[PDB]
Amino acid sequence: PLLQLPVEVKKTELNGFWDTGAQITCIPEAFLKEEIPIGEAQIKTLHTKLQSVYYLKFKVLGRKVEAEVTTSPFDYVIISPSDIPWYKPQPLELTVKLPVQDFKKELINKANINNEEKKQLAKLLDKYDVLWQQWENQVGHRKIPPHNIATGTVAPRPQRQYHINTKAKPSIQQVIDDLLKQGVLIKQTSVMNTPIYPVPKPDGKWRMVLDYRAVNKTVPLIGAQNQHSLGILTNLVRQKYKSTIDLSNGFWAHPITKDSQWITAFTWEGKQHVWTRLPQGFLNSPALFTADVVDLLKNIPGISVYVDDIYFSTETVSEHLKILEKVFKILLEAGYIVSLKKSALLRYEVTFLGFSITQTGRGLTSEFKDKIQNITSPRTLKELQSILGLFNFARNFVPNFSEIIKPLYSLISTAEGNNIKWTSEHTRYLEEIVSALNHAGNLEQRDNESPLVVKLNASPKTGYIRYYNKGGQKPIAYASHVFTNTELKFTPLEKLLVTMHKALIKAIDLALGQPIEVYSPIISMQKLQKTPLPERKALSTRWITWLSYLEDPRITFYYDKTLPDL
Amino acid sequence: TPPLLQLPVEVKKTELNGFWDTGAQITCIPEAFLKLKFKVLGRKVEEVTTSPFDYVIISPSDIPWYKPQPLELTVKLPVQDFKKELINKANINNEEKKQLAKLLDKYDVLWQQWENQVGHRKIPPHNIATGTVAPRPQRQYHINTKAKPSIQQVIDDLLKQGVLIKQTSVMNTPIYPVPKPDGKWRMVLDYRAVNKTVPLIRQKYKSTIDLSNGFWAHPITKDSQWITAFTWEGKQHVWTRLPQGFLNSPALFTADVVDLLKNIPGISVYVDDIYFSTETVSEHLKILEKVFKILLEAGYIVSLKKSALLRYEVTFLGFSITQTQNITSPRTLKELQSILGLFNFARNFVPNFSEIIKPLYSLISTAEGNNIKWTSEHTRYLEEIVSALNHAGNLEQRDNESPLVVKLNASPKTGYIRYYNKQKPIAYASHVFTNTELKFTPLEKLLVTMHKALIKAIDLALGQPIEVYSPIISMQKLQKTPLPERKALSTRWITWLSYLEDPRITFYYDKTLPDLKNVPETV
DNA sequence: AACAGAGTGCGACAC
DNA sequence: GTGTCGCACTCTG
């Protein structure tokens, strides 16, 4: 199974894709630049442009052929099937077929559109039936040149395979046989060999990931920075109708060069196999994959893609359906497929990257709220760091989070070894955290076209910070700073100022080039510049940071006569 | 009428940039491969030799199917309307003005007719990875969505010319966008973490011709490209040329034009501008053709919009190129009081200061209230204190071995800088604020007087380190700023970042000499 | 016995 | 003191 056909043009060799939807064979423009056009016809593209028809001879699979071609936007050949009536690809048969008709039916009934709009929806999914995952372990075929992932200078030491869990050996076995049939795996001896280590899932199945740490040591990390879960969450748009589309087995769609394949080798039940697409557990497999998908969809407005999960939102369902179809088409020509089960399209609210995007705003999921009620008091340091780490996820949703978490954070230094000094008063602290997070509010998004309002204030012990959009009533996020020992000795103004400094470090990124406005209990900034030196208790290096903000043009300050306290 | 362009090549599973020269029928390729048959643009054919650089020369006789086309970007500037403006702005005699128009039109290949158009120097490419330890890759935050299509069009244009290519690198530099005056945005590359790992490298008729994006005309070697990488729309983009914001890119840029024009006397280039002056209009036009020819042959392109010529007045280095201390008397006690503070530094290095300064103290005390009476004799006793300080009073000569300390400050209408040597100063400075500068904020006033104090500083330094002392604070914070709070900077602080990234000069704030109300200099 | 990003705090050592 | 940079844990795909 090639699923890409060797095509030879002008004594050169490209790849030809057999497109049923191709009314005409296209061809890269570099080959038609010397030929004479024979006709002009409107040609269907993603963005129906009028192209010119040619007459060219070439050969596919080695057999001479010839017909009417046209210029292609890509470096590969789109093939009208009528141009090669002798060739016919066979269908696709793996192990377990999925209930794709059930996936569609489920996805429509959950859709928040009307019955007339629901019909428009139902037609669209039956139309792109070729786009949805139809078998277990079905992989797409990305039409990009293969990656050379073996960018190393020193060779890695081969690993002896260690123990595979017996409970996983049937699950991997089907995957390997399913991946072998689609050409993803190849039986091949190799210099390198790495251990296959399945990771569990909530369902009885198991994942194909491998201990690639030895290989990872000899390969440099790709420096691209295209995963920012917070930046997406804080900057996505939240109109009426929202939807998420989950790519399926995205790694296994990116081809890797043959010379780069040996580094992926692993041993399974006696024989040594070699990956052909980006394997899982490899250090550059994320950065390479997520680069391609985020590059593909950049021009789709209002979109947000995290690795293989795609969110967007519009106000009217009519536009949502147009953009949705545009997305499906871009994925299909690219060679990607979509898991319909993992995705949900058209709802007043949907959960994205661990938060629920309700019609009112970004909030904590019910699934998370159950996660935190169901914790017991910790017994070891690792347990303390897990309860702390889970709590930390929700930090932005309560005005004074950094207070109630401090008594728990302090317990890890006083603890010696893994044993910890938990008290009845300590458990009480744990309960207060959960109740505030239980009753925690709903968070706003960042208006990328409006100034950033940052309202700050401080008490003798800690300093509080809330962010808003100019005139916005619900905050984007909460923050607060516990004054350390050295900060406590500061004058009340210097406490306000070290609170402001810790805000602006964050608020500079939050503005996205917009202006910034500061509301504070400080009457005038100019009197602060001339505060007597025998009055300022903090060091001079802390006062150059604070005074520098008065010189930044992107920020102005304001006095707000609201909520003083001490 | 835009000019020709290069073509992508690839030989033996190796990606390379390729260039077309009409002359040679012998292609040449880097020798490292040759321990014949290869593809260019996708089509493949076979007669080569070795090349001087990592670049490839193609034989045009080898690829008949390829006929180059005029250069096409996204936005075409009105080249003729720029040409007529420089004609109409030329305060020169009319028949000569028409003759210059004829010369300007003759070189439609030197001017830029395309937004974000780049040139190309046939110089050997620059090895800019001259550090020893690699910079730590840097993280990136989400970009303002309104800023993306502006930057995307700029990147799309740079990709089509081959300036930017999509390549994965080990390193990564942040990118932050900033508003332009119009509705578009501008891309900034925050190369500080990169910069810290690499070693640092007049008459009647006047004119200023300004090269356009000269940085992007300098090829950089292939093994030095990885360090320039930034991540746009989730893919890493690598520069094939000197990037804006790199350390040694301004130095390597202007060092090329001064040597291009080394044989022409009287030139004065600064970063991106070119300065020439002549006695007549006949000589002025003869040098234009001489200078324009060198630029074309080398490979730059100049923007007619940003240039000015044949004017009795031009601007250059922030000043006015015209044709070919002291104060004003005080009115209230506040003016006189800020005078005493100005010269309070001099009590240390001047022997007879107490007696000269005694007039001032007596006037402040005798006249109660805010209404001061200052006799016309007091005005003359300041006339001596000015002239006494500048002439020769305890002024040490510049020591070429020691670093230079410069303390600057400004009044509302005038600016006052001074220079020491790591017991008394070297020399003094004075700037009167123009009508545009007079409307600035006191910070902005105190800021132009630093630029000007720094042009003389780099002159009087003779290469030594520099220490700047001003009432500007964020200068010193920007100098040493901890990396958790590094972040992005506002437009004004970028130009001074270029000065700041210099490991030789250091900025300080000392809090001395306030003078909010000092009467201006004499007219 | 896997990967990458985001986030947080702690903590030994630097200066 | 302020500051680096490695570690721990959590979340996301």
The residue behind tokens 């002359």 is B23
In sequence order, the 6+-apart residues with CB closer than 8 A to the CB of A323 are: A300, A301, A302, A312, A314
Identity of the amino acid at B513: L
Rounded Cα–Cα distance for residues A394 and A363 (Å)? 9
Class of residue B170 by CB neighbours under 10 A (exposed 0-12, middle 13-18, buried 19+) = middle
Rounded Cα–Cα distance for residues B209 and B177 (Å)? 28
Q: Shortest CB distance from B172 goes to which of A75, A224, A505?
A: A224
* φ, ψ for residue A404, nearest 5 deg: -65, -20
| Residue ranges of B 118-157 with Cβ closer than 8 A to chain A | 137-148, 152
Contact between the CB of B75 and strand D at under 7 Å: no
Q: Indicate which residue of A19, A126, A211, A292 is catalytic.
A: A19
- Distances from the Cα of B418 to the Cα of B27, B119, B222, B290, B346, angstroms: 60, 42, 46, 41, 12
Q: Whats the size of chain B, residue-wise?
A: 523
Contact A467, A454 (CB under 8 A): yes
**Strands of the B205-210 sheet, one edge to the other:** B268-270, B273-278, B205-210, B308-311
Resolution of the structure, angstroms:
3.1
Cβ within 8 Å, pair B234-A291: yes
Any CB–CB contact under 8 A between B487 and chain A? yes
Contact between the CB of A413 and strand C at under 7 Å: yes
Coil, strand or helix at A346: strand
Q: Given the DSSP bridges, would you call strands B466-470 and B404-410 parallel, antiparallel or unpaired?
A: parallel
Any CB–CB contact under 8 A between B463 and chain A? no
Instruction: Tokens for A267, please give them.
Output: 């041993």
Residue B231 CA to chain centroid, in angstroms? 25
Instruction: Tokens for A284, please give them.
Output: 């550059």
In sequence order, the 6+-apart residues with CB closer than 8 A to the CB of B236 are: A222, A223, A224, A291, B166, B167, B168, B169, B172, B229, B230
In sequence order, the 6+-apart residues with CB closer than 8 A to the CB of B355 are: none
The residue behind tokens 């968070």 is A443
Three-state SS across B494-510? HHHHHHHCCCCEEEEEC
Among chain B residues, the shortest Cα distance to A504 is held by B485
**Strands of the A309-314 sheet, one edge to the other:** A303-306, A309-314, A241-247, A338-347
What are the respective helix, strand and coil percentages of chain B, to the nearest 5? 35, 20, 45
Q: DSSP code of A446?
A: -
Return the closest nucleotide (C1') to the Cα of A412: C10
The residue behind tokens 């009340």 is A492
Instruction: Tokens for A535, please give them.
Output: 């009055």
Rounded Cα–Cα distance for residues A406 and A395 (Å)? 12
- Distances from the Cα of B166 to the Cα of B71, B163, B229, angstroms: 21, 10, 9
Rounded Cα–Cα distance for residues B302 and B299 (Å)? 10
Identity of the amino acid at A383: E
How would DSSP label each residue in A458-520? E-SSEEEEEEEETT-SS-S-EEEEE--HHHHTS-HHHHHHHHHHHHHHHHHHHHTTS-EEEEE
Give, for A455, the enclosing helix (H) or strand (E).
strand A452-458
Instruction: Tokens for A80, please give them.
Output: 């009208």
Output the CA torsion sign for B265, B266, B268, B272. Answer: negative
Cβ within 8 Å, pair B473-A547: yes
Identity of the amino acid at B409: N
Give, for A323, the enclosing helix (H) or strand (E).
helix A317-334
Rounded Cα–Cα distance for residues B379 and B406 (Å)? 29
The residue behind tokens 């006062």 is A543
Rounded Cα–Cα distance for residues B517 and B523 (Å)? 18
Contact between the CB of A65 and strand D at under 7 Å: no
Coil, strand or helix at A328: helix
Instruction: Tokens for A458, please give them.
Output: 């401080």
Partnered with residue A468 across adjacent β-strands are: A453
Strand C positions within 7 A of protein Cβ atoms: 1-11
Output the CA torsion sign for A80, A84, A85, A89. Answer: negative
Contacts of A231 in chain B (CB under 8 A): 141-142
Contact between the CB of A280 and strand C at under 7 Å: yes
Return the closest nucleotide (C1') to the Cα of B486: D3
Q: Given the DSSP bridges, would you call strands B56-58 and B38-40 parallel, antiparallel or unpaired?
A: unpaired
Breaks in chain A after residues, C-to-N cutoff 2.5 Å: 47
Contact between the CB of A227 and strand D at under 7 Å: yes
- Distances from the Cα of A326 to the Cα of A116, A119, A124, A322, angstroms: 20, 18, 11, 6
Identity of the amino acid at A266: F
Contact between the CB of A214 and strand C at under 7 Å: no
Partnered with residue B499 across adjacent β-strands are: none
A contact test, residue of B148, B225, B235, B472 with most A CBs within 10 A: B235
For chain B, the distance separating the N- and C-terminal CA atoms, rounded to the nearest angstrom, is 52
CA atoms within 13 A on the CB side of B491: 14
Rounded Cα–Cα distance for residues A159 and A195 (Å)? 6
How would DSSP label each residue in A526-559? HHHHT--TTT--S-HHHHHHHHHHHH-TTEEEEE
Largest Cα separation within chain A, whole Å, is 93
Q: How far is B383 from chain A (nearest CA, A)?
A: 33
Identity of the amino acid at A212: Y
Torsion of CA B21, B23, B25, B31, to 10 degrees: -60
* Nearest-CA residue relative to C1' of D10: A389
Any CB–CB contact under 8 A between B497 and chain A? no
Identity of the amino acid at A421: K
The residue behind tokens 């007597």 is A532
Domains of chain A: 5-83 (2.40.70.10), 166-356 (3.30.70.270), 362-438 (3.30.70), 452-559 (3.10.20.370)
Rounded Cα–Cα distance for residues A401 and B260 (Å)? 63
In sequence order, the 6+-apart residues with CB closer than 8 A to the CB of B247 are: B191, B194, B195, B198, B200, B201, B501
Q: How far is B361 from chain A (nearest CA, A)?
A: 25
Instruction: Tokens for A459, please give them.
Output: 């008490």
In sequence order, the 6+-apart residues with CB closer than 8 A to the CB of B116 are: B73, B74, B75, B153, B154, B157, B158, B213
Q: Given the DSSP bridges, would you call strands B48-50 and B27-29 parallel, antiparallel or unpaired?
A: parallel
How would DSSP label each residue in A351-413? EETTEEE-SS-EEE-HHHHHHHHTPPPP-BHHHHHHHHHHHHTTGGGSTTHHHHTHHHHTHHH
Any CB–CB contact under 8 A between A235 and chain B? yes
Cβ within 8 Å, pair B235-A221: no
Coil, strand or helix at B206: strand
* φ, ψ for residue A4, nearest 5 deg: -160, 130
Cβ atoms < 10 Å from Cβ of A292: 20
Contact A299, A227 (CB under 8 A): no
